[PDB]
User: Fold Flagellar L-ring protein from Salmonella typhimurium.
Amino acid sequence: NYGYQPLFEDRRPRNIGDTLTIVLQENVSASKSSSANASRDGKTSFGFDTVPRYLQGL
Amino acid sequence: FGNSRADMEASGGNSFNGKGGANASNTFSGTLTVTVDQVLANGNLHVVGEKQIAINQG
Ligand SMILES: CCCCCCCCCCCCCCCC(=O)O[C@H](CCCCCCCCCCC)CC(=O)N[C@H]1[C@@H](OP(=O)(O)O)O[C@H](CO[C@@H]2O[C@H](CO)[C@@H](OP(=O)(O)O)[C@H](OC(=O)C[C@@H](CCCCCCCCCCC)OC(=O)CCCCCCCCCCCCC)[C@H]2NC(=O)C[C@@H](CCCCCCCCCCC)OC(=O)CCCCCCCCCCC)[C@@H](O)[C@@H]1OC(=O)C[C@H](O)CCCCCCCCCCC
Ligand SMILES: O=C(O)[C@H]1C[C@@H](O)[C@@H](O)[C@@H]([C@H](O)CO)O1
Assistant:
């Protein structure tokens, strides 16, 4: 090979045949949450158990 | 009031309770290298990137 080569550079790959080292160190994490609620409660009462003579009509 | 004509007794109740709620959370803790798609008029860059990983069986 007659190609020029720098002395002080970091010897990065530059041509087709050059080799490079890859450190994967891949780490991905995704999360998703959702919630919903709805509560309704009702309860009504009414009773005499004793009615006046004048109110017995109703 | 000689008889129970005036004797009176009555009770009544009405209770109502309603509730509602909702939640929504999401998280993402990755790192992805993207490539510029185009340069906008103001200098903003449109970036698009994709990464495919085949650990095993998918
Ligand atoms: C937002 C506000 C808007 C305004 C709303 C207006 C009022 C909106 C309307 C509210 C009133 C409900 C109407 C109920 C009667 C009715 O029409 O709808 C019925 C179906 C229900 C539909 C209702 C959906 C509304 C939908 C909701 C709408 C809400 C908006 C059909 C029906 O008719 N069913 C019917 C049938 O059943 P059957 O199907 O099986 O056959 O026959 C059987 C057997 O009949 C009985 O026989 C007895 C002997 O056996 C006999 O006694 P005896 O003496 O003879 O012995 C006895 O005679 C008697 O009472 C003898 C005598 C009693 C006097 C004692 C003193 C009481 C004073 C008491 C004083 C009251 C004080 C308020 O009378 C009366 O003078 C009654 C008083 C009149 C007051 C007038 C108000 C002046 C304003 C005074 C104002 C005061 C100012 C401070 C006989 N009674 C009857 O005939 C029935 C009727 C005869 C009518 C002739 C009298 C002149 C009416 C003249 C005009 C009336 C027009 C309305 O009386 C009533 O109650 C009428 C009540 C009217 C109150 C309106 C208030 C307006 C405020 C004004 C406000 C604007 C009944 O049991 C059964 O009726 C019953 O069960 C009813 C039960 O009792 C009573 C439960 C009441 C609980 C509250 C409701 C709770 C319900 C809640 C859930 C929905
Ligand atoms: O003075 C009246 O009017 C009464 C007194 C009570 O006894 C009452 O209940 C009624 C009865 O129904 C008569 O049979 O008479």
